Design an enzyme around this catalytic site. Structure first.
Site, mmCIF file in Angstrom:
data_model
loop_
_atom_site.group_PDB
_atom_site.id
_atom_site.type_symbol
_atom_site.label_atom_id
_atom_site.label_comp_id
_atom_site.label_asym_id
_atom_site.label_seq_id
_atom_site.Cartn_x
_atom_site.Cartn_y
_atom_site.Cartn_z
ATOM 1 N N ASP A 1 5.978 3.940 5.165
ATOM 2 C CA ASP A 1 6.740 2.876 5.808
ATOM 3 C C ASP A 1 6.622 1.565 5.050
ATOM 4 O OD1 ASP A 1 4.036 3.092 6.822
ATOM 5 O OD2 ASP A 1 4.506 1.474 8.235
ATOM 6 N N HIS A 2 5.959 1.580 3.894
ATOM 7 C CA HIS A 2 5.909 0.431 2.993
ATOM 8 C C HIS A 2 6.433 0.694 1.584
ATOM 9 C CE1 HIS A 2 3.492 -1.888 5.918
ATOM 10 N NE2 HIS A 2 3.232 -0.655 6.336
ATOM 11 N N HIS B 1 1.468 3.814 2.035
ATOM 12 C CA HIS B 1 2.091 4.481 3.171
ATOM 13 C C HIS B 1 3.613 4.434 3.061
ATOM 14 C CE1 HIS B 1 -1.728 4.191 5.857
ATOM 15 N NE2 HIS B 1 -1.647 5.358 5.240
ATOM 16 N N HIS C 1 -7.911 -0.780 5.344
ATOM 17 C CA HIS C 1 -6.802 0.084 5.773
ATOM 18 C C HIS C 1 -6.772 1.415 5.030
ATOM 19 C CE1 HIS C 1 -3.109 1.056 7.824
ATOM 20 N NE2 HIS C 1 -2.408 1.115 6.703
ATOM 21 N N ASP D 1 -0.498 -3.996 5.912
ATOM 22 C CA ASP D 1 -1.361 -3.454 6.961
ATOM 23 C C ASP D 1 -2.813 -3.720 6.572
ATOM 24 O OD1 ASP D 1 0.949 -2.432 8.125
ATOM 25 O OD2 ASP D 1 0.517 -0.326 7.632
ATOM 26 N N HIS E 1 6.042 -5.867 11.997
ATOM 27 C CA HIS E 1 5.355 -4.572 12.084
ATOM 28 C C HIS E 1 4.622 -4.400 13.427
ATOM 29 C CE1 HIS E 1 2.507 -1.339 10.865
ATOM 30 N NE2 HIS E 1 3.221 -1.131 9.765
ATOM 31 N N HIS F 1 0.853 -1.191 0.000
ATOM 32 C CA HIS F 1 0.000 0.000 0.000
ATOM 33 C C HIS F 1 0.886 1.237 0.000
ATOM 34 C CE1 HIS F 1 0.648 -0.585 4.371
ATOM 35 N NE2 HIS F 1 0.108 0.597 4.626
ATOM 36 N N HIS G 1 -5.691 -0.331 11.886
ATOM 37 C CA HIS G 1 -4.975 -1.598 11.946
ATOM 38 C C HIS G 1 -5.829 -2.632 12.654
ATOM 39 C CE1 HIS G 1 -1.428 1.134 11.425
ATOM 40 N NE2 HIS G 1 -1.057 0.161 10.613
HETATM 41 C C1 LIG Z 1 10.689 14.723 7.282
HETATM 42 C C2 LIG Z 1 9.218 14.564 7.077
HETATM 43 O O1 LIG Z 1 8.485 15.541 7.035
HETATM 44 C C3 LIG Z 1 8.649 13.196 6.939
HETATM 45 C C4 LIG Z 1 9.393 12.091 7.343
HETATM 46 C C5 LIG Z 1 8.847 10.821 7.304
HETATM 47 C C6 LIG Z 1 7.545 10.611 6.860
HETATM 48 C C7 LIG Z 1 6.927 9.263 6.921
HETATM 49 C C8 LIG Z 1 7.702 8.110 6.788
HETATM 50 C C9 LIG Z 1 7.132 6.857 6.957
HETATM 51 C C10 LIG Z 1 5.787 6.736 7.253
HETATM 52 C C11 LIG Z 1 4.997 7.874 7.363
HETATM 53 N N1 LIG Z 1 3.612 7.742 7.601
HETATM 54 C C12 LIG Z 1 2.761 6.975 6.887
HETATM 55 O O2 LIG Z 1 3.114 6.290 5.929
HETATM 56 C C13 LIG Z 1 1.329 7.004 7.367
HETATM 57 C C14 LIG Z 1 0.845 5.647 7.894
HETATM 58 C C15 LIG Z 1 1.540 5.209 9.169
HETATM 59 C C16 LIG Z 1 2.072 6.157 10.045
HETATM 60 C C17 LIG Z 1 2.663 5.775 11.242
HETATM 61 C C18 LIG Z 1 2.746 4.433 11.575
HETATM 62 C C19 LIG Z 1 2.234 3.488 10.692
HETATM 63 C C20 LIG Z 1 1.622 3.840 9.492
HETATM 64 B B1 LIG Z 1 1.083 2.478 8.775
HETATM 65 O O3 LIG Z 1 -0.414 2.416 8.672
HETATM 66 O O4 LIG Z 1 1.580 2.128 7.376
HETATM 67 O O5 LIG Z 1 1.516 1.481 9.719
HETATM 68 C C21 LIG Z 1 2.247 1.995 10.860
HETATM 69 C C22 LIG Z 1 5.569 9.128 7.195
HETATM 70 C C23 LIG Z 1 6.814 11.718 6.426
HETATM 71 C C24 LIG Z 1 7.359 12.990 6.463
HETATM 72 FE FE LIG Z 2 -0.292 1.579 6.585
HETATM 73 FE FE LIG Z 3 2.515 0.256 8.250
#
Ligand SMILES: CC(=O)c1ccc(-c2cccc(NC(=O)CCc3cccc4c3[B-](O)(O)OC4)c2)cc1
Ligand SMILES: [Fe+3]
Ligand SMILES: [Fe+3]
Ligand SMILES: [Cl-]
Ligand SMILES: [Cl-]
Length: 433
Positions: A79-80, A77, A155, A176, A392, A75, A370
């Site tokens: 972190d994927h 997001h 999700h 997720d 995760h 998906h 989740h």
């Molecule tokens: C510097 C700055 O400005 C910046 C840095 C990093 C990010 C960043 C990185 C990874 C994930 C995310 N956030 C998401 O993908 C949104 C979904 C999310 C967010 C937190 C945890 C989880 C998820 B889950 O649903 O997928 O599972 C665990 C944001 C965004 C902005």
């Molecule tokens: Fe997610």
């Molecule tokens: Fe996630």
């Protein structure tokens, strides 16, 4: 193990290996390696939201990217899929990459926004787009003798659970997923095809989610309290996905409360979502310079964990006034400001390095979509995979989930499921006849 899809003399056995390069006993940078009968598959390619630079990547240095046949992205997001342009453009990877149509359509606009707020550039992102193939739900594709197909994960829009089949052995990766109907999303499917191996998220451990009507009511009451006392209410969100659910909730609450109709609600974003919601009380906001910061008000702004950007700027503008408040609706990953303020620190540090007192209220009401323990337990019981691999989830949450799941199948003479919680870089090995 005899593949479930199967007294004859068994021939030699084949070893299947699973190894997290990220999201092993953590949340963030999902990246899981599968090896079986000469095929190598990577499941997801994310970044960690609470780390910086190359530290935020999965441990890709432990594999030879030129050997990976197939990369599946669950998906949009980050972190994927946040590391994907780096992996496609800056490594020796030469395999095939798949995501659902909606995931690819959102991913292109999403990571461009991410760059404009370093592992890769906008040029890297655009040059890697054509390397990504799309897949419809419920259709088999085949790459290098690997068959795969996907199910709806719930999700977020486009989210998939991939089923993979190699030499009769079947593995399901949830990504997720959510089994709770949303106002705009269907719940994840439960496959009738039963896998030998399940790789499943562990985000909320053995927690049980509060009833949706009760969380919505507490969310609306908290926003109402903030604006009623003259405060500005900040709701940090990822740009797309859960934000649309929150806006529908708020718009409905505002319509039902005329005493709030003069109080604005701003959605500060940067549209194929509806292609794949005409609010009466919500206004679009393009940037901080387009915003008259008049109190009281509600502003929904990205990023969701307030690491930088507009949500961080508004937080720093508003945090010293006890009338204001922030409502955090996502999962708060270690290393982020949104997680840090959960400990109720007396002061915070601005991006420019200044100390400010934290006086605004801080409330956590999760809508992160989740699975919870009841949903995960039901899902596993419907499928009965002999092997379950947890990914995760934070270490303690995942350890409790593992212990609770093992307890559920101790007195079961039909199957004794084995549950694995590998650390990053740790291999799980499984032998099939
Ligand atoms: C510097 C700055 O400005 C910046 C840095 C990093 C990010 C960043 C990185 C990874 C994930 C995310 N956030 C998401 O993908 C949104 C979904 C999310 C967010 C937190 C945890 C989880 C998820 B889950 O649903 O997928 O599972 C665990 C944001 C965004 C902005
Ligand atoms: Fe997610
Ligand atoms: Fe996630
Ligand atoms: Cl074969
Ligand atoms: Cl090893």
């Amino acid at each position: 193990l005899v593949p479930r899809g199967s007294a004859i003399p068994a021939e030699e056995s084949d070893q299947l290996l699973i190894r997290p390069l990220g999201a092993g006993q953590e949340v963030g940078r999902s990246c899981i390696i599968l090896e079986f009968k000469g095929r190598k598959i990577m499941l997801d390619c994310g970044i960690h939201p609470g780390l910086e630079g190359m530290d935020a990547l999965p441990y890709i240095d432990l594999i030879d990217p030129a050997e990976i046949d197939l990369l599946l992205i669950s998906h949009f997001h980050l972190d994927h899929c946040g590391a994907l342009p780096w992996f496609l453009q800056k490594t020796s990877f030469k395999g095939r990459t798949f995501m659902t149509h909606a995931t690819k359509a959102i991913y292109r606009w999403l990571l461009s926004d991410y760059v404009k707020v370093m592992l890769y550039t906008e040029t890297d992102l655009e040059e890697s787009m054509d390397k990504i193939e799309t897949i419809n739900f419920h259709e088999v594709k085949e790459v290098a003798g690997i068959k795969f197909w996907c199910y709806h994960a719930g999700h977020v829009l486009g989210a998939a659970m991939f089923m993979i089949e190699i030499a009769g052995v079947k593995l399901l990766y949830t990504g997720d997923f959510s089994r709770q109907e949303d106002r705009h999303l269907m719940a994840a499917e439960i496959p009738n095809i039963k896998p030998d191996i399940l790789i499943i998220e562990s985000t909320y451990g053995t927690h049980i989610h509060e009833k949706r009507e009760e969380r919505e009511a507490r969310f609306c009451n908290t926003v109402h309290d903030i604006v009623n006392r003259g405060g500005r209410g900040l709701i940090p969100v990822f740009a797309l996905g859960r934000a649309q659910e929150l806006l529908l909730i708020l718009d409905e609450y505002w319509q039902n409360h005329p005493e709030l109709h003069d109080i604005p609600i701003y959605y500060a974003s940067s549209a194929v979502y509806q292609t794949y919601f005409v609010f009466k009380h919500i206004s679009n906001l393009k940037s901080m310079d387009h915003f008259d910061d008049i109190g009281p008000s509600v502003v929904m702004a990205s990023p969701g964990m307030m690491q930088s950007g507009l949500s961080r700027e508004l937080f720093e503008s508003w945090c010293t006034d006890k009338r204001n408040g922030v409502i955090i609706a996502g999962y708060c990953v270690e290393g982020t400001l949104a997680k840090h303020i959960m400990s109720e620190p007396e002061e915070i540090t601005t991006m420019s390095g200044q100390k400010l007192p934290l006086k605004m209220s801080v409330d956590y009401i999760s809508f992160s979509a989740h699975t919870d323990y009841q949903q995960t337990s039901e899902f596993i019981r419907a499928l009965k995979p002999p092997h379950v691999i947890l990914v995760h989830g934070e270490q303690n949450e995942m350890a409790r989930l593992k212990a609770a799941l093992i307890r559920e199948y101790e007195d079961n003479d039909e199957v004794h499921i084995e549950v694995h919680n590998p650390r990053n870089t740790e291999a799980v090995t499984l032998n099939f006849r």
